[PDB]
Scaffold this active site. Structure first.
Site, mmCIF file in Angstrom:
data_model
loop_
_atom_site.group_PDB
_atom_site.id
_atom_site.type_symbol
_atom_site.label_atom_id
_atom_site.label_comp_id
_atom_site.label_asym_id
_atom_site.label_seq_id
_atom_site.Cartn_x
_atom_site.Cartn_y
_atom_site.Cartn_z
ATOM 1 C CG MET A 103 -2.060 -1.082 1.085
ATOM 2 S SD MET A 103 -3.094 -0.807 -0.373
ATOM 3 C CE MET A 103 -4.513 -1.891 -0.050
ATOM 4 C CB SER A 104 0.561 4.634 1.381
ATOM 5 O OG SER A 104 -0.566 4.999 0.600
ATOM 6 C CB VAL A 105 5.039 0.916 2.682
ATOM 7 C CG1 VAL A 105 6.544 0.688 2.654
ATOM 8 C CG2 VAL A 105 4.561 0.949 4.133
ATOM 9 C CE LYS A 107 0.638 8.034 -1.155
ATOM 10 N NZ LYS A 107 -0.149 6.770 -1.261
ATOM 11 C CE1 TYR A 207 0.018 9.615 2.478
ATOM 12 C CE2 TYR A 207 -2.107 8.654 3.061
ATOM 13 C CZ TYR A 207 -0.792 8.507 2.656
ATOM 14 O OH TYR A 207 -0.293 7.250 2.415
#
Lengths: 384, 384
Positions: A103-105, A107, A207
């Site tokens: 997921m947003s890790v 990013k 965010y």
């Protein structure tokens, strides 16, 4: 139009192949060697049911750790102290070398690729996004700097009410192939990004996953590489990783930079190891010493007005696609929905990876529990 | 209705998850560890442009071999003599350990899984398909035996005119996710199969990919395993393969048994090695000695009226998902469109793998050239 994008293979026409053309020449020479990029696919195991718990030394200081991991829907958990794996846990049915969605890790990995190009002098964070992606003129990304995208300090009309199909958040998923397309939807992620608008104000943290995909677009325009390849060339291939990572791709082959990477827990820890080694990995320097220092230092506290973060971390901030707790330990973390963390504990030279599947993408409850675990484990690593 | 199918994960509802539900609980615990099964995905390489030609000893007997391989759009080529790799070729841009789509060579793997279950006594080829899949009552598969499916001796109204969207061949692709769905299309591969009709006659060979997917459906009903898992359990996991294989899956997670497997050339050769070892692989027996003998012996010649095959191989036939040349060498081969072969040369105890990407799925021209290469290489292995 969204301008030039990296060809799927040498000589490929724009947007080719599609689901309906991959069997045709000249596409099929590439497609036959990469079919998973076109059609959902399953692994057929070359290897012929119970949780694996090797919590090592910290088990004595945290007697209820396995239960706490179970309670937070932990799939994979790994603690790297220096260069040594000192604790591991994998749920029943998840192997140590299985890959897990970040997921947003994801990013934080994208920001690292941007950092690599800053180190090479190919991206200037002070420059406007439009210096690199002119086609974002007329959008909310017309005006802001690359650094403001990196720090997510751009005001964007971006409805996060997922259940509403009209919401930007669900439309983002549909444009990228994470959900079924609806009539009228943007053709791909690039087009979706150009539809985004805002009041023009900047400086306050908001965010927004669109920001990361803009970073990936910039990476492509600067390097001429598909983001998939750039992520390998500037990061993954330098880690001496056990396995390839994977990333979901949209219909043009554009990787879902904001959320679509999967990898093993042990390999993700190598990214943290690189950050705690001043930006250097086994295969060479990834980012500059200065970039790492800026990440550990944090972003503007004034900009950070997300109470979901600051209620726990009053002096917290965000910079360059990392969350910075501003706590006494200086913890910094990649974070993704449903309980993903790439957590850095510089005090003890340690990295904690926790990959999970909470039933909910976010609640205050889950984050309170998860952060309690990461902090407890961090403190358990202190000299005594 | 198409009846009970193997759940995507323990406890999963029928048909779950879908592209629109995989992020929701309880699906997400499985989906986060298997996202490539839901969304097209690319590899991010852990490793940081020129053809590799190691044609070994046979190079002296076939001076123009590399050129002949280039001319037939060869991506990977490997000759296994006994247990030894004696010749290899990989085109520029295709690594020795890259995986390649097998197309209908996949059928020979499916037939092998069926053979494994015959060996265990769980499938009786003499029994009607409906003994195992009652829901195929009322279709062209109502009446024929499992063996007639294995030997493809069922008359089916199955238009092979691909360009016509009304054709069964393109509809098969759409139902399975190989092409974009059209309104009214069957929901999945199982449903597509039930729509098939024929005049009721049997005994004459008719090559039809639907047959193989019926075999996979039978495998699922007999074992309770997803075909993806059955292919591993009964074959792939016993090969001591270097890499997992992959297989495309439709929206229910059903593997495209007839054509969707990808694997390395070296690993595919292990399947041939097993066949030439009487059905035994490193990890145990896969099929019976009798099954292998029946494959090498061939099917009914009377049944084989495909001139595209018999013009080259007058005494050729087909049985149990293998093409049998009936030539003086007793060659038998798995074959797939665009130039895929798993070619067995029992005389020299050798296996030839050729994986290609011809611009056309089939022409007489391509097959003449390809068969010329396989026969020349086979003869080059003879003692002299």
């Amino acid at each position: 139009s969204t301008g030039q994008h990296p060809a799927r293979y040498p000589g490929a026409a724009a947007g080719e192949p599609t689901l309906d053309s991959w069997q045709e020449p000249p596409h099929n020479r590439w497609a036959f060697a990469h079919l998973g990029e076109m059609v959902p696919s399953a692994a057929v195991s070359r290897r012929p049911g119970h949780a694996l718990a090797r919590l090592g030394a910290i088990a004595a200081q945290l007697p209820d750790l396995e239960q706490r991991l179970e309670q937070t829907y932990t799939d994979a958990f790994l603690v790297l102290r220096g260069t040594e794996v000192v604790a591991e846990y994998y749920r029943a049915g998840f192997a140590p070398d299985d890959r897990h969605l970040l997921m947003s890790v994801s990013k934080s990995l994208c920001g690292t690729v941007v950092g690599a190009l800053v180190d090479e002098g190919r991206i200037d964070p002070a420059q406007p996004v439009t210096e690199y992606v002119p086609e974002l003129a007329g959008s909310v990304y017309d005006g802001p700097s690359v650094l403001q995208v990196l720090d997510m300090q751009i005001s964007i009309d971006y409805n996060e009410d997922y259940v509403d199909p009209a919401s930007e958040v669900q439309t983002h998923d549909r444009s990228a192939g994470w959900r079924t397309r609806r009539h009228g939807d943007p053709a791909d992620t690039y087009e979706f990004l150009t539809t985004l608008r805002g009041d023009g104000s900047t400086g306050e943290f908001q965010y927004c996953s669109a920001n990361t995909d803009v970073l990936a677009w910039i990476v492509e325009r600067v390097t001429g590489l598909r983001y998939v390849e750039a992520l390998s060339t500037y990061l993954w291939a330098k880690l001496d990783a056990d396995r390839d990572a994977t990333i979901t791709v949209d219909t043009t082959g554009f990787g879902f930079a904001n959320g679509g990477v999967s990898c093993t827990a042990r390999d993700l820890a190598r990214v943290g190891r690189m950050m705690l080694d001043g930006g250097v990995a086994p295969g060479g320097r990834v980012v500059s010493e200065d970039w790492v220092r800026r990440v550990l230092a944090g972003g503007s506290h004034e900009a950070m007005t997300d109470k979901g973060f600051t209620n726990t971390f009053p002096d917290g901030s965000y910079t360059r696609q990392w969350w910075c707790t501003g706590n006494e330990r200086g913890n910094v973390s990649g974070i993704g929905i449903h309980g993903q963390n790439l957590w850095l504990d510089p005090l003890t030279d340690s990295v904690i990876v926790k990959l999970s599947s909470w039933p909910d993408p976010y609640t205050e409850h889950w984050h309170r529990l998860q952060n309690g675990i990461l902090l407890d484990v961090s403190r358990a690593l202190d000299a005594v």
